[PDB]
Amino acid sequence: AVPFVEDWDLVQTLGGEVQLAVNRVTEEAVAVKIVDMNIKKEICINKMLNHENVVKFYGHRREGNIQYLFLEYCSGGELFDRIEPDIGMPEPDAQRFFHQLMAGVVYLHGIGITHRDIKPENLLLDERDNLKISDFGLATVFRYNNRERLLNKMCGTLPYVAPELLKRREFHAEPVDVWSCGIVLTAMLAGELPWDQPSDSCQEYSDWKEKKTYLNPWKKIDSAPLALLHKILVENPSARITIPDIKKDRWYNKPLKKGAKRPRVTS
Numbered sequence: 506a507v508p509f510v511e512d513w514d515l516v517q518t519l520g521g522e523v524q525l526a527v528n529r530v531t532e533e534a535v536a537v538k539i540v541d542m543n544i545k546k547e548i549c550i551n552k553m554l555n556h557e558n559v560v561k562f563y564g565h566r567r568e569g570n571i572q573y574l575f576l577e578y579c580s581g582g583e584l585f586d587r588i589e590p591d592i593g594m595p596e597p598d599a600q601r602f603f604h605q606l607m608a609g610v611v612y613l614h615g616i617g618i619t620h621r622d623i624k625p626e627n628l629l630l631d632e633r634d635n636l637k638i639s640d641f642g643l644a645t646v647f648r649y650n651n652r653e654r655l656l657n658k659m660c661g662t663l664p665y666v667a668p669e670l671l672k673r674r675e676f677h678a679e680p681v682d683v684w685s686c687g688i689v690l691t692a693m694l695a696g697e698l699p700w701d702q703p704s705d706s707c708q709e710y711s712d713w714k715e716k717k718t719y720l721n722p723w724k725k726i727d728s729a730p731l732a733l734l735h736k737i738l739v740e741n742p743s744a745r746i747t748i749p750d751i752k753k754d755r756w757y758n759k760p761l762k763k764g765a766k767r768p769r770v771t772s
């Protein structure tokens with residue numbers, strides 16, 4: 506209808522490659538994922554998605570052997586850059602980001618999708634610091650026609666992967682995403698990852714199973730969120746807390762965080 510409304514200028518590299526695109530007419534900002542030929546499954550999964558804590562998918566264009574993915578631009582950047590090394594962030598900010606992460610994950614599991622690579626690099630923030638789950642490149646459908654299929658593929662990032670992925674041939678999808686959410690929560694509250702990987706050979710992982718919480722990173726975390734981490738970072742995935750029970754947790758429901766300060770005057 507309106508000329509040049511389909512034209513986007515690529516103005517900067519955000520993170521294949523991810524570039525910030527600005528509309529020539531409306532000045533609307535979107536993120537364009539350029540993939541030089543996993544991607545067929547990524548587009549298919551992105552077409553199913555519609556939630557306030559999941560990166561929006563606007564559409565895709567194919568120019569020969571190159572795939573263009575038009576995705577939500579999040580001006581707040583990555584959650585990763587809000588974590589101060591060896592410190593973390595204020596507990597009320599981490600609680601709010603954790604609430605929004607749980608809302609995103611509940612939505613994905615509800616439509617039978619597992620992300621499989623939850624980590625602060627894949628959690629983006631909008632202009633109002635709302636968390637958005639990003640990159641469905643490793644995501645897969647674990648429930649179809651109300652039938653659950655057990656996973657067996659090695660996917661993810663070692664410091665965030667659940668121990669069953671390294672020890673068992675097959676495993677349920679949902680406890681794997683719950684575990685990575687617990688590692689994200691640890692990182693937000695301590696500014697450090699507890700272990701290189703969740704194996705008996707890793708001293709830090711053995712110390713946690715022996716409840717040595719007087720050591721780092723656990724010593725930096727208050728007893729209320731630490732009690733929640735004791736229920737998430739459980740080696741047996743069948744005994745691990747589920748998201749309905751995380752929503753009933755005492756720290757999860759603890760009042761800590763004030764709303765965004767809103768302009769006010771006196772007298």
Ligand SMILES: N#Cc1cnc(NC(=O)Nc2cc(-c3ccccc3)[nH]n2)cn1
Nearest residue numbers: 519536560576577578579580582639640
């Ligand atoms: N896969 C994927 C993906 C990657 N990025 C997306 N959106 C986005 O806005 N990414 C982004 C934005 C920034 C950024 C960096 C510094 C300052 C402000 C924003 N980094 N990365 C959307 N989907």
